[PDB]
Amino acid sequence: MLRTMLKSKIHRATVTCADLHYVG
Amino acid sequence: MLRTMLKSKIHRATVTCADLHYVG
Amino acid sequence: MLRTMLKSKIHRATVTCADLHYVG
Amino acid sequence: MLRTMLKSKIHRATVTCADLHYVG
Amino acid sequence: XVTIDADLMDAADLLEGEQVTIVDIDNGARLVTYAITGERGSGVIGINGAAAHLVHPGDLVILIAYATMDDARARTYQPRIVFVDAYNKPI
Amino acid sequence: XVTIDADLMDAADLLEGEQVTIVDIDNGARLVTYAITGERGSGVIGINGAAAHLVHPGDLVILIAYATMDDARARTYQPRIVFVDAYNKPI
Amino acid sequence: XVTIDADLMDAADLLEGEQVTIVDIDNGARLVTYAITGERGSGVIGINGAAAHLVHPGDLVILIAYATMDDARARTYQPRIVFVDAYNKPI
Amino acid sequence: XVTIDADLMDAADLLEGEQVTIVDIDNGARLVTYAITGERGSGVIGINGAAAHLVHPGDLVILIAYATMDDARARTYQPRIVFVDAYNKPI
Ligand SMILES: O=C(O)c1cncc(Cl)n1
Ligand SMILES: O=C(O)c1cncc(Cl)n1
Ligand SMILES: O=C(O)c1cncc(Cl)n1
Ligand SMILES: O=C(O)c1cncc(Cl)n1
């Protein structure tokens, strides 16, 4: 039996940039 | 071959509080 | 490496009933 | 312990058709 | 949840409690729920609990289950596809 | 996230950090979060962070956790189903 | 469902029936579906069924598949990234 | 997708290409994407492509990764929780 568990959390980070047309 | 099956259900509980700005 | 694959599909079923307050 | 990782990416394809009533 | 006629569950190889994705052709709703065994041959497709907000009686739906398997098995595994009439009987 | 009374977590066999699906009977919201252990016997069901936009105090919710298992175990596995009173105490 | 040109499926290492996430750059819709093999070299990206409510002809989309793998393989695995021209041909 | 400062990826034990859930404290959006390694010590949290419709610069977000693990490991596993300042530097 496999359970799905929290592994990683970065808490209350601020989004610094967004790019709709990112290529990569 | 792994299936996803229901493991746990808490049925029709009442939300007691909500905190947008929880830290933890 | 594990892939997620289609296992089962029931195609174009008609919903016959709904119960918002189902107990079970 | 199993991680979910990116395996495949098709980047910035153009949708050529859409069919609500496809059967297959 | 979703109550499914036991005949469709056998035909589709679904177990009671197996995770199921419901997609609604009428309104475009998409949600994840689990299968409950319904009266065999009744043609029941019953939406139970919070899902009833999104998926309604008379809607055409597609019910999907997925499995995780290793690359080798994935290339040979054949999915169970069940077509149904207007009364939710297999064809 | 979701803070759950430790008694309900024991009753439902839920671990701190286990992934949990919350579905809201009042407004039909559906989201995926993880379980945090709440004060035992308090009847606490606490929505923390971004989830508070979708799930509000006094809402009736269903909390669901899933397990991945081999075909053989899936056919025999019995889920833990917990019924609660108006004060979120098990029955 | 999503019908994909067999060339892009080979290029991206996608099997018929593999779970696929579609994200729509035009309207921000996000959904989970499975891959169907389309006519090779046709440049077909076909939205079938309920998904057509959310993803429309002419929309720019990103198609994503994920794999579950042991920690060791996850650190070394190299994903298949396929860039395409305006006609859905690989570069 | 989401471009993350390599220091936060190391701190949170995230690999390039690992599936990540972003939850937005400001507007309540919740979506699934994958991690891209960003310039180390830059404090970059970059939303790339379709996700930019839902999650915006200046929003407070929580980034989550999940693992599938056997019951035995799930009971003992200790998650990596990374708290950050206003400039996305670990504490
Ligand atoms: O109320 C629902 O929609 C429901 C009920 N039980 C389980 C799940 Cl996943 N959803
Ligand atoms: O604030 C939330 O809704 C939240 C908190 N922590 C983890 C997740 Cl997935 N969601
Ligand atoms: O109509 C749809 O969107 C659809 C059809 N078949 C499977 C899935 Cl997941 N979705
Ligand atoms: O534009 C996005 O949201 C996006 C881009 N690349 C991958 C994924 Cl999962 N999402």
Author numbering:
A (entry chain A), B (entry chain C), C (entry chain E), D (entry chain G): 1 to 24
E (entry chain F), F (entry chain D), G (entry chain H), H (entry chain B): 25 to 115
In the authors' words:
We also tested PZA, nicotinic acid (NA), and two POA analogs with chlorine atom at the 5-(para) or 6-(meta) position. None of these compounds inhibited Mtb PanD at concentrations up to 20 mM, except 6-Cl-POA which was also competitive and slightly less potent compared to POA (Ki = 1.00 (0.04) mM, Fig. 1c). The ITC data fit to a single-site model, with a Kd for POA of 0.71 (0.03) mM (n = 5) and that of 6-Cl-POA as 1.09 (0.04) mM (n = 3). The molecular surface of the active site indicated there was room to add a substituent to the pyrazine ring of POA at the 6-position based on the pose we selected. This was consistent with the finding that 6-Cl POA was an inhibitor of PanD and 5-Cl POA showed no inhibition. We cocrystallized Mtb PanD with the 6-Cl POA analog and refined the structure to 2.25 Å. A polder OMIT map showed clear electron density for the 6-Cl and it was oriented with the pyrazine ring in the same orientation as we fit POA. The POA binding pocket is relatively small (206 Å3) and not easily accessible, as there is only a narrow tunnel leading from the active site to the inside barrel of the PanD tetramer. With a diameter of ~3.4 Å, neither the substrate nor inhibitor could pass through the tunnel. The chlorine atom of 6-Cl-POA resides in this tunnel.
Here, we present biochemical and structural evidence that POA inhibits Mtb PanD in a competitive fashion and that it binds with a high degree of complementarity to the active site of the enzyme. PanD is a proenzyme and in the structure, we observed the processed active enzyme after cleavage between Gly24 and Ser25, and modification of Ser25 to a pyruvoyl group (Pyr25). The active protein consists of a β chain (Met1-Gly24) and an α chain (Pyr25 to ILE115). Our results show that resistance to PZA in PanD mutants primarily comes from alterations in two loops covering the active site that have subtle, but significant effects on the affinity and residence time of POA on the enzyme rather than from directly affecting POA binding interactions.
